[PDB]
Amino acid sequence: RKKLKAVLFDMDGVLFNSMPYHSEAWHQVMKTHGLDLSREEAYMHEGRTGASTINIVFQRELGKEATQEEIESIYHEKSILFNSYPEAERMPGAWELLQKVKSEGLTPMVVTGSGQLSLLERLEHNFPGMFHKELMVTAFDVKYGKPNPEPYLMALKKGGLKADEAVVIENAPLGVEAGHKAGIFTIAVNTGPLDGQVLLDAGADLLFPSMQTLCDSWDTIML
Amino acid sequence: KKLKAVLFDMDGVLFNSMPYHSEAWHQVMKTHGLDLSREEAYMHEGRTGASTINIVFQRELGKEATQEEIESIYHEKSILFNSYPEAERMPGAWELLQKVKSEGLTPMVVTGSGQLSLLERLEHNFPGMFHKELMVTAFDVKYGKPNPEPYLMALKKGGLKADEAVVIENAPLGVEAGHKAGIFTIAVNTGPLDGQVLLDAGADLLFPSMQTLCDSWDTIML
Amino acid sequence: RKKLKAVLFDMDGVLFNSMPYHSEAWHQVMKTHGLDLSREEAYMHEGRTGASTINIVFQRELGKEATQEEIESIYHEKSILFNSYPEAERMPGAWELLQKVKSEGLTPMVVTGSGQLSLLERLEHNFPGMFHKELMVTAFDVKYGKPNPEPYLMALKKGGLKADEAVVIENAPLGVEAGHKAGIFTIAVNTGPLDGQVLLDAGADLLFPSMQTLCDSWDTIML
Amino acid sequence: KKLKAVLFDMDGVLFNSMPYHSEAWHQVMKTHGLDLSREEAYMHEGRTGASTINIVFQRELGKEATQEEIESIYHEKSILFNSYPEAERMPGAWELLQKVKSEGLTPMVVTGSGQLSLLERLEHNFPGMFHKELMVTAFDVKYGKPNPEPYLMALKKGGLKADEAVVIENAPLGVEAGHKAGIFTIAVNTGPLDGQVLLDAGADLLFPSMQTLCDSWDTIML
Numbered sequence: 097r098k099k100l101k102a103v104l105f106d107m108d109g110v111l112f113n114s115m116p117y118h119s120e121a122w123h124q125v126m127k128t129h130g131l132d133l134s135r136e137e138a139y140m141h142e143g144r145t146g147a148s149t150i151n152i153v154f155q156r157e158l159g160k161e162a163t164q165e166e167i168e169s170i171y172h173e174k175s176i177l178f179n180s181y182p183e184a185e186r187m188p189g190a191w192e193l194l195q196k197v198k199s200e201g202l203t204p205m206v207v208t209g210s211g212q213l214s215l216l217e218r219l220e221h222n223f224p225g226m227f228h229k230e231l232m233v234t235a236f237d238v239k240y241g242k243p244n245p246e247p248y249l250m251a252l253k254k255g256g257l258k259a260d261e262a263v264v265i266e267n268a269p270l271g272v273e274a275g276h277k278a279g280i281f282t283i284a285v286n287t288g289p290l291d292g293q294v295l296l297d298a299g300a301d302l303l304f305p306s307m308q309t310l311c312d313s314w315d316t317i318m319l
Numbered sequence: 320k321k322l323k324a325v326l327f328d329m330d331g332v333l334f335n336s337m338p339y340h341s342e343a344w345h346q347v348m349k350t351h352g353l354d355l356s357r358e359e360a361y362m363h364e365g366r367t368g369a370s371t372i373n374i375v376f377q378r379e380l381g382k383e384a385t386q387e388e389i390e391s392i393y394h395e396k397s398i399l400f401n402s403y404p405e406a407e408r409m410p411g412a413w414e415l416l417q418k419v420k421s422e423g424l425t426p427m428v429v430t431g432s433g434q435l436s437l438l439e440r441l442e443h444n445f446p447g448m449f450h451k452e453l454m455v456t457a458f459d460v461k462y463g464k465p466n467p468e469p470y471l472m473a474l475k476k477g478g479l480k481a482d483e484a485v486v487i488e489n490a491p492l493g494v495e496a497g498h499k500a501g502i503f504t505i506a507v508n509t510g511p512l513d514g515q516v517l518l519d520a521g522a523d524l525l526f527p528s529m530q531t532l533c534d535s536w537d538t539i540m541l
Numbered sequence: 542r543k544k545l546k547a548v549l550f551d552m553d554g555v556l557f558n559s560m561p562y563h564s565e566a567w568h569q570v571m572k573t574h575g576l577d578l579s580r581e582e583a584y585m586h587e588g589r590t591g592a593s594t595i596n597i598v599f600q601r602e603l604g605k606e607a608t609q610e611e612i613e614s615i616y617h618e619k620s621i622l623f624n625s626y627p628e629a630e631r632m633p634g635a636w637e638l639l640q641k642v643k644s645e646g647l648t649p650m651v652v653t654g655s656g657q658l659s660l661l662e663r664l665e666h667n668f669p670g671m672f673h674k675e676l677m678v679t680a681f682d683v684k685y686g687k688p689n690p691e692p693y694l695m696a697l698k699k700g701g702l703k704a705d706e707a708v709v710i711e712n713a714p715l716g717v718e719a720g721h722k723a724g725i726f727t728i729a730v731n732t733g734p735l736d737g738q739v740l741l742d743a744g745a746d747l748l749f750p751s752m753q754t755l756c757d758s759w760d761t762i763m764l
Numbered sequence: 765k766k767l768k769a770v771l772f773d774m775d776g777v778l779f780n781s782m783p784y785h786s787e788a789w790h791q792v793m794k795t796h797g798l799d800l801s802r803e804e805a806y807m808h809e810g811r812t813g814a815s816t817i818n819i820v821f822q823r824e825l826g827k828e829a830t831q832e833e834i835e836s837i838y839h840e841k842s843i844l845f846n847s848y849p850e851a852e853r854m855p856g857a858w859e860l861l862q863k864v865k866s867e868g869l870t871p872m873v874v875t876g877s878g879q880l881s882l883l884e885r886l887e888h889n890f891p892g893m894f895h896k897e898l899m900v901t902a903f904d905v906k907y908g909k910p911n912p913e914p915y916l917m918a919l920k921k922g923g924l925k926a927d928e929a930v931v932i933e934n935a936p937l938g939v940e941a942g943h944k945a946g947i948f949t950i951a952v953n954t955g956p957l958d959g960q961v962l963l964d965a966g967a968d969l970l971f972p973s974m975q976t977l978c979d980s981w982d983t984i985m986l
């Protein structure tokens with residue numbers, strides 16, 4: 097596009113291959129509490145904040161919301177379990193795509209409702225020189241999280257951008273929904289186990305099978 | 320069955336009010352230079368007025384509406400809605416309520432509506448059916464559909480567990496709220512959307528109208 | 542409707558509760574031949590003639606069509622297995638609905654590509670006085686079968702009817718597709734294990750959960 | 765990989781001919797008092813001319829077209845199609861073919877088209893790529909897409925099993941034919957339909973264009 101200034105990347109399943117760990121950790125911590133959240137459902141709910149994920153389960157199974165102390169207790173258990181796995185590595189193609197974006201004079205940004213500190217603290221070491229602190233959105237900015245467009249709208253505000261000056265790179269239907277409802281052109285990369293139809297149904301303007309094929313295709317789609 | 324209660328949505332289930340709500344949202348947004356189509360208003364059916372306004376601002380302006388903007392637009396919408404000849408009952412709603420009540424079940428209303436003209440007409444339209452203590456309205460909720468909050472609140476007011484209730488809904492966000500509350504949810508497709516959207520939202524059954532639901536009730540509850 | 546003259550009923554899963562048997566028999570006969578057709582896939586393919594069902598499997602698994610002698614051999618094995626089960630009983634609500642249709646001066650018809658003779662020979666005993674021989678479509682009329690609209694168009698021709706003078710009652714997505722592509726108002730009854738969305742996606746104008754609820758609702762929908 | 769061959773559809777994959785086919789079908793049907801929209805012509809992409817004509821007759825007239833009707837309508841459609849400036853290559857098709865050939869794979873064409881002007885331009889557009897003995901056209905088939913017949917015939921002509929080939933298709937009925945042949949099928953969404961329809965038909969991968977497929981080929985074949 098001719099108007100493009102910024103590329104807004106989600107983190108889990110776009111920059112880091114972290115979803116096998118998040119899905120396993122959510123499934124196991126819920127099971128420890130006698131609550132049912134399958135690994136597949138964890139993928140379906142990918143994009144929600146920790147508080148929202150916990151509340152989905154509490155609301156359907158226990159008929160109430162979690163209290164804040166329950167949210168914090170369960171999230172801390174989930175985070176400990178996530179961190180017990182060998183640390184998540186970069187999605188293949190992410191670094192190469194970021195280099196391309198930057199070389200073209202575009203501003204990369206990260207937009208996530210993650211509170212998984214061990215990942216956030218590794219962004220610079222994994223993608224050196226790509227991201228600016230003042231141009232990032234994390235759990236420490238967000239009140240609602242995806243699928244609310246709030247995090248992407250916050251990224252636009254931080255960047256001094258209009259929606260038509262950005263592209264979102266997302267991999268999960270709730271994350272695509274947030275980008276789309278922010279009015280931003282959204283590219284889905286199907287890096288999980290779900291059908292690509294769910295990404296398109298959520299509003300993705302393009303769909304690719306992987307970050308590496310997006311990288312391979314980037315110059316063509318931006319022409 | 321351990322069925323004890325039937326939780327009815329109001330707009331498009333008890334009253335034929337959606338042609339009016341969709342028109343009024345479309346028109347008031349148009350007055351403010353914002354594009355909200357009648358079809359889109361149906362897609363948003365279920366949300367509170369404040370949430371509806373915010374979502375349009377988020378997409379079209381890249382920001383949340385201010386509290387002032389929400390109050391002003393909603394005030395205009397309510398005036399316009401009430402300028403139409405008052406909404407009539409959905410055919411079949413009263414017959415179904417008599418059936419439910421005759422079977423010893425407790426009718427409840429669950430809505431994020433704060434439309435006083437409709438809420439204060441419930442008793443006159445469905446005499447003896449509903450009680451303020453057994454209703455959830457805009458005045459009870461923080462989030463509203465599609466959050467299961469209002470249905471969970473109704474369960475609590477009724478002293479119910481989710482497996483003791485059935486929800487009757489007509490809109491995808493409403494079906495989603497009932498389903499995410501863990502409650503068996505029957506969709507009645509009383510609007511212009513494809514029924515697939517109601518099933519996709521988690522409806523356990525789909526009927527084309529309140530009258531066919533009424534006709535079919537004793538069979539499905541066997 | 543004010544134009545309605547005829548109601549065109551499918552047989553399997555609408556008049557007879559025969560689909561648990563057809564699906565099991567197809568699955569088992571294919572397994573005997575070292576071919577994969579799941580019970581769920583048998584439901585997905587409900588509506589196809591025997592030759593078509595066999596060819597779906599041969600084409601995807603063996604890279605060719607079945608010969609006619611193979612089709613007849615395998616179909617006869619399937620029919621023997623189907624007939625080894627206690628004979629299929631009426632769908633609850635079918636007889637009551639047919640009585641209603643007839644009392645309203647509508648002409649009931651049967652439209653099926655089934656060659657399962659044991660069911661066809663039982664139609665009169667199960668629904669006495671409802672159907673006319675000259676106003677039926679079976680495997681012995683059809684060249685292609687559902688999802689081709691051919692069988693429903695043949696029913697219209699036999700009945701001296703225009704598409705707008707009939708209603709189809711179907712329960713399977715390929716059968717709904719045939720009715721819809723014949724230009725006929727089609728009511729789906731979800732009497733199997735599939736999602737109702739598949740019936741609606743195929744073109745059904747109404748969807749009910751069972752023959753008994755259709756029966757309960759018939760006078761309302763025809764007003 | 766035991767990959768040996770790449771089976772290309774023609775219209776909307778090798779040539780940008782679908783704006784012309786859809787317009788010509790729409791117009792010729794209109795001349796005969798039959799409603800076939802341009803969008804519907806895209807939905808039917810893949811079918812042989814005879815099948816396309818029959819389906820419209822079945823829905824609108826309640827009968828099959830006669831052989832005479834099929835021959836007359838098809839004759840008119842072919843004349844109209846060829847009255848447009850001849851269709852150009854899909855960007856990326858030639859580069860992809862060079863890549864495929866360089867990797868030792870056998871290109872094939874699989875189509876129910878009998879459009880001689882396009883079939884007889886294959887060699888001039890893609891020199892050295894294709895051979896008549898390794899093609900399937902309208903002149904080979906009894907049924908055509910979405911029956912897997914044409915893909916199965918291509919496998920046979922190439923001495924292939926289904927696990928030794930990849931199909932490149934752009935239309936839902938074409939994807940369906942490849943998938944029902946048991947062949948890995950890549951959809952390229954080069955028309956106006958939603959990509960969900962291509963995935964619903966059984967595509968294993970979806971790309972937005974022939975050029976992005978070309979760009980991505982070496983990565984997906986790793």
Ligand SMILES: [Ca+2]
Nearest residue numbers: 106108109268
């Ligand atoms: Ca993600």
Ligand SMILES: [Ca+2]
Nearest residue numbers: 243273465495
């Ligand atoms: Ca949503």
Ligand SMILES: [Ca+2]
Nearest residue numbers: 288289290291
């Ligand atoms: Ca999967």
Ligand SMILES: [Ca+2]
Nearest residue numbers: 296299300958
């Ligand atoms: Ca789309």
Ligand SMILES: [Ca+2]
Nearest residue numbers: 328330331490
């Ligand atoms: Ca409603």
Ligand SMILES: [Ca+2]
Nearest residue numbers: 510511512513
């Ligand atoms: Ca509609």
Ligand SMILES: [Ca+2]
Nearest residue numbers: 518521522736
């Ligand atoms: Ca369902």
Ligand SMILES: [Ca+2]
Nearest residue numbers: 551553554713
């Ligand atoms: Ca059937």
Ligand SMILES: [Ca+2]
Nearest residue numbers: 688718910940
């Ligand atoms: Ca079809």
Ligand SMILES: [Ca+2]
Nearest residue numbers: 733734735736
């Ligand atoms: Ca099921």
Ligand SMILES: [Ca+2]
Nearest residue numbers: 513741744745
């Ligand atoms: Ca429909």
Ligand SMILES: [Ca+2]
Nearest residue numbers: 773775776935
């Ligand atoms: Ca094509």
Ligand SMILES: [Ca+2]
Nearest residue numbers: 955956957958
């Ligand atoms: Ca389109």
Ligand SMILES: [Ca+2]
Nearest residue numbers: 291963966967
């Ligand atoms: Ca798939």
Ligand SMILES: [Mg+2]
Nearest residue numbers: 243273465495
């Ligand atoms: Mg949702």
Ligand SMILES: [Mg+2]
Nearest residue numbers: 688718910940
């Ligand atoms: Mg098909």
